[PDB]
Amino acid sequence: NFQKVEKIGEGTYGVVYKARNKLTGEVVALKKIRLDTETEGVPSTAIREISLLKELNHPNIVKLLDVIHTENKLYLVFEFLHQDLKKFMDASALTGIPLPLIKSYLFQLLQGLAFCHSHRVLHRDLKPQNLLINTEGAIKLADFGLARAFGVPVRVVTLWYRAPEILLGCKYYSTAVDIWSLGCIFAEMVTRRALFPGDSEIDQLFRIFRTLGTPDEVVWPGVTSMPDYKPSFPKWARQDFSKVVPPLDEDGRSLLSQMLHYDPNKRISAKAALAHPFFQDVTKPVPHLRL
Numbered sequence: 001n002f003q004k005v006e007k008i009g010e011g012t013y014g015v016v017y018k019a020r021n022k023l024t025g026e027v028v029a030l031k032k033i034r035l036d037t038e039t040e041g042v043p044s045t046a047i048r049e050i051s052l053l054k055e056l057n058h059p060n061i062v063k064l065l066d067v068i069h070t071e072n073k074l075y076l077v078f079e080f081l082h083q084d085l086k087k088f089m090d091a092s093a094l095t096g097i098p099l100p101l102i103k104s105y106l107f108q109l110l111q112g113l114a115f116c117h118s119h120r121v122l123h124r125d126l127k128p129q130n131l132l133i134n135t136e137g138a139i140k141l142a143d144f145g146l147a148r149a150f151g152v153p154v155r156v157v158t159l160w161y162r163a164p165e166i167l168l169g170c171k172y173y174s175t176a177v178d179i180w181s182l183g184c185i186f187a188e189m190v191t192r193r194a195l196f197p198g199d200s201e202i203d204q205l206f207r208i209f210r211t212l213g214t215p216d217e218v219v220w221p222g223v224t225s226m227p228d229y230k231p232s233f234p235k236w237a238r239q240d241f242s243k244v245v246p247p248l249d250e251d252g253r254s255l256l257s258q259m260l261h262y263d264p265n266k267r268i269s270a271k272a273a274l275a276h277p278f279f280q281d282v283t284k285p286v287p288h289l290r291l
């Protein structure tokens, strides 16, 4: 029922094609979901989880158009967008993305997050490659909720945006994990360099600690009892944000600090972040996009 137009890439869960729906003419992103058994068919809890996502609709969430479970295989049909934030950042490297556009994108992403989180759905794997942009100035979160439905594999899956509680082996993390990832992405928009580009779980942890300080029981009650916490972690002091994300203004640096609080219970929520004075002068610029 779908004509493949071209291969978009290898996604987190399998190959993704730009395709045309033969009975509506709609152009879509068609995602084949890799079965690990392949042979046993689609686990039923995955189908039920994914089916729930068909209802979690918001303008800043890439729309799940259809779920097709046939021949004991799984395909997801998503709304197609022409650019991603990773590609847009690479393109804007000389000049950087203008503040007003960073601000608009951050605000839109926080709306999408606050919607999802109010329904107790997390993303868990936000990263620039899953932040998609249209010609209208919109940015939208892709693959929302797929991590809970299918798992997140090691394969390399980037660790750069992973929250510290996940890295310390917490099993029962919260919506705070997405706020951490979006804070990382905010910082990368501003500086044009990834904030914490680890190449292993411990390198990721120690890059975080080198910037934000090694966490202790003062800033994060309970941290020393986390599964993968080690008393022998090096004890680094915290750096100034003014060093970390120049030339971001005081309001941005305030917001960023709250999004990168170690204690997930103290980390700002998406709802609260929408109220932050950083967004007092937010607008919706139209991006400069060549397709």
Ligand SMILES: O=C(Nc1ncnc2[nH]cnc12)c1cccs1
Pocket: 008, 009, 010, 011, 012, 016, 029, 062, 078, 079, 080, 081, 082, 129, 132, 142, 143
């Ligand atoms: O799926 C990807 N990119 C995508 N590109 C256009 N529209 C999409 N809607 C949902 N995902 C989309 C991937 C990018 C790189 C690998 S897969």
